[PDB]
Amino acid sequence: LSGTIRPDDISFDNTIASNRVSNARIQYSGTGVQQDMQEPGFLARFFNVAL
Amino acid sequence: LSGTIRPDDISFDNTIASNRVSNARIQYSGTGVQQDMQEPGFLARFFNVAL
Amino acid sequence: DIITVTLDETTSATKSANADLSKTNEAQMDPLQVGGEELQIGGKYNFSYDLNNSNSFAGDSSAKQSNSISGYITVEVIEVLANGNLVIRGEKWMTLNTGDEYIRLSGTIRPDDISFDNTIASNRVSNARIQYSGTGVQQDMQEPGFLARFFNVAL
Amino acid sequence: NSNSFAGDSSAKQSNSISGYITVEVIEVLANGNLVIRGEKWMTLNTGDEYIRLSGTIRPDDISFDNTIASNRVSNARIQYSGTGVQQDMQEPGFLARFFNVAL
Amino acid sequence: NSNSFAGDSSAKQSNSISGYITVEVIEVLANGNLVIRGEKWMTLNTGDEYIRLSGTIRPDDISFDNTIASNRVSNARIQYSGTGVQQDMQEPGFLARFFNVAL
Amino acid sequence: AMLQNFGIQMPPGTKPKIKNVAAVMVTAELPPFSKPGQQVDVTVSSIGSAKSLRGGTLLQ
Amino acid sequence: AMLQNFGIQMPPGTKPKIKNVAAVMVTAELPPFSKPGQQVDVTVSSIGSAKSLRGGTLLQTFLKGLDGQVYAVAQGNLVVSNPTVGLISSGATVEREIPNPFGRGD
Amino acid sequence: TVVDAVEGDKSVDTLRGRSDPVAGDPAWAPIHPKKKPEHYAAATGSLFSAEHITDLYDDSKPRGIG
Amino acid sequence: LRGRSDPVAGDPAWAPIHPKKKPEHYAAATGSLFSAEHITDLYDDSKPRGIG
């Protein structure tokens, strides 16, 4: 996560909601052979971009 | 999102409704092979514009 | 110094991820008929077409892990650190009928975490090393051996 | 005439861990934040499992019983895994990895 | 295409003992801890069973009736077993041991 | 927050039940050519609901 | 926490039921050229809900400067007239020196 | 040598088409706050320093690097 | 044939750091038992504040 926040939006327990973050970049993903199963590869990508 | 707003429309918690934004440009979309599945491509576009 | 450790550990971890992609096309047109006859483009081409595609993908992965131990183990202080923390270590052996089992615990604890009855929880032990296992022919039945290990590492 | 198109995509991901891990302070920062690190090994019957945690925490987030939640740890690195032939069963190996990366 | 993999591992272990054993102090340590040791033999009809316990205890853990729990014993060595032809039936012997260590 | 500054941190949601402490606003006028080490008057006015500030002591 | 510092640690959640102890804020002013071993007055003011500090005894408290370092230790017997504010004539013993620019320059 | 013994050497993508992130990337690593300079109270005779004072009543929101 | 290297228990990269021993006070220099590095506040909560 990266972004810009206001100190006024930080609650009493030092927590801020994610929708209060300006220029937010949120990335939740995996890595390795586990992530290899989530993508189709070249074969299906060509078929999907052609049809 | 881009647009022009009045400071009078900003509520107490520093939040403004999206229907109060003048010259609004709202874009919610994807990117990559995920977005490739959302469009038909040239073949269906030609058939749809011819018939 | 003798300190009693209550073995109460329970860890559980799960993860999951999956993805889908799908796309389809279906465009069909019957030959155009105008004026009672079938229109022809060029010399042999009709005003008709037929398109049919279907692409699909699905991929998922998962993992899961958990463990727990319950019991007691009494250890002793083997070293006192500069801040007063106590490095503890001890082992415990039990031979019930046949076969020896052992419990071994080492780690570092705070004296502040030792309760009134001279007992400390096992999750309060820093650098914990907990070992509960057997020995002998009883433990030989718990491992597959070379044959299955090679098959499991090859496939 | 009859033209038709339909295309969709989806994804999903989740995880959870539950347990305890006791670590120690390895460095004190300029603002008083504490860099923590530690590991924990358990051999139950056969096979060794480990838990490893590192990160940076605020002393203000440490509760009264000297316990801090894991979501309060900055730059967190949490690792819960096994070791040995037990972990060999959790991975497919070269054969399935090549098939999964090719298709 | 269709690729699939699944791999799991598991282990489990437990034990329990219930009874009584009366031992004696064999050594007094510098901090007042007591090193204890003792054995107990019972021949009921046929075959001898024994209980053996050794370890170190705190005098603070000895209750009012001069009894201490077995989980309060440091460096505990508890042995409950039999002897003779009765114990011969509890072990498989060389033949099954070789088969179990080979497979 | 002041108690946390001295090493006493109450668990969240704990009501102090204080009755000898009042929140105030402190105002001072800095005379011209005021040098470090000099002392000036301060006016202390209560901003909460304290009934009296008589006999009090202003903290840092 | 103070009782833990002496070897008595109550089980968690135990209510002390104390009635002769009051939490206070101790303030001392360090005169210029204060040397270690000297004694200064301290003002003791109650911050909780104690009805009176009359006849009390201030336990060992460390007095911190604006830089967060301890410069004195305060004990002694309170002399109260407002029953919640008392004074000690030599409560704080100076334990550290603060440097001075008096001898510098022309 | 350039490899530390304690930490160790920290050093088919063409068929994947993607590059996986690495844990510990400096582009995402935290920044340790700069150490404040010492006050040198001997210059003024006072323990007050504008960069070192702590307000007793502030909520201590994040206000600086780290 | 595995393609992975298993961790080892006791790795110095994850082992705890024993705190540095504080120097002795030498009260004979000042005549007092006060030492800024050795005093213990009676009322502090004793949060973690140093290595170890």
Side-chain angles (χ1 to χ4, degrees), chain C residues 110 112-113 124, chain D residues 58-69, chain F residues 4 7-14, chain G residues 1-4 9-16, chain I residues 42-49:
Chain C
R110 298 191 313 151
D112 306 77
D113 291 335
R124 293 284 177 172
Chain D
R58 298 191 313 151
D60 306 77
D61 291 335
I62 299 170
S63 59
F64 179 63
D65 55 327
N66 198 78
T67 313
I68 184 176
Chain F
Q4 294 180 23
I8 295 90
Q9 176 170 335
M10 297 174 260
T14 295
Chain G
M2 177 191 69
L3 280 194
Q4 294 180 23
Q9 176 170 335
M10 297 174 260
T14 295
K15 306 161 64 177
Chain I
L42 293 182
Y43 324 104
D44 200 313
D45 280 0
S46 295
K47 281 189 190 296
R49 57 195 61 172

Side-chain angles (χ1 to χ4, degrees), chain G residues 25-31 40-44 63-64 72-74 91-93:
Chain G
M25 271 288 158
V26 194
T27 304
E29 176 176 11
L30 215 58
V40 304
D41 313 291
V42 289
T43 304
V44 180
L63 301 175
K64 287 151 56 176
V73 183
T93 304

Side-chain angles (χ1 to χ4, degrees), chain F residues 5, chain G residues 63-71 96, chain H residues 47 52-54:
Chain F
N5 282 113
Chain G
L63 301 175
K64 287 151 56 176
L66 274 182
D67 59 333
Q69 311 294 321
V70 176
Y71 284 87
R96 194 176 167 181
Chain H
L47 303 171
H52 295 271
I53 51 173
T54 295

Side-chain angles (χ1 to χ4, degrees), chain A:
Chain A
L1 186 138
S2 64
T4 311
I5 64 176
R6 298 191 313 151
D8 306 77
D9 291 336
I10 299 170
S11 59
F12 179 63
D13 55 327
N14 198 78
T15 313
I16 184 176
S18 66
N19 49 262
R20 293 284 177 172
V21 178
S22 173
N23 216 24
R25 306 274 184 277
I26 308 176
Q27 303 168 33
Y28 182 30
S29 180
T31 288
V33 67
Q34 286 71 24
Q35 194 68 15
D36 284 332
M37 321 306 288
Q38 324 290 344
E39 287 119 7
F42 163 78
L43 301 180
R45 284 183 182 187
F46 176 75
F47 292 157
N48 292 326
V49 80
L51 283 313

Side-chain angles (χ1 to χ4, degrees), chain C residues 9 12 29 67 123 126 132, chain D residues 1 18 22 40 43 45 49:
Chain C
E9 298 278 22
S12 183
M29 167 171 185
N67 65 1
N123 49 262
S126 173
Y132 182 30
Chain D
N1 292 137
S18 186
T22 310
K40 171 185 187 176
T43 299
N45 193 11
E49 335 176 74

Side-chain angles (χ1 to χ4, degrees), chain H residues 24-61:
Chain H
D25 197 319
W28 293 91
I31 307 173
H32 292 358
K34 193 190 303 182
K35 188 60 177 181
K36 285 134 52 180
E38 291 285 345
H39 166 40
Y40 191 66
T44 56
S46 174
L47 303 171
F48 178 87
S49 184
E51 311 89 14
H52 295 271
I53 51 173
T54 295
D55 186 51
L56 293 182
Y57 324 104
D58 200 313
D59 280 0
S60 295
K61 281 189 190 296

Side-chain angles (χ1 to χ4, degrees), chain B residues 4-26:
Chain B
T4 311
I5 64 176
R6 298 191 313 151
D8 306 77
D9 291 336
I10 299 170
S11 59
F12 179 63
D13 55 327
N14 198 78
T15 313
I16 184 176
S18 66
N19 49 262
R20 293 284 177 172
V21 178
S22 173
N23 216 24
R25 306 274 184 277
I26 308 176

Side-chain angles (χ1 to χ4, degrees), chain C residues 74 76 95 97 101 117 141, chain E residues 15 71-72 74 78 80 100:
Chain C
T74 310
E76 296 185 25
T95 299
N97 193 11
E101 335 176 74
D117 55 327
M141 321 306 288
Chain E
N15 65 1
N71 49 262
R72 293 284 177 172
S74 173
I78 308 176
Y80 182 30
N100 292 326

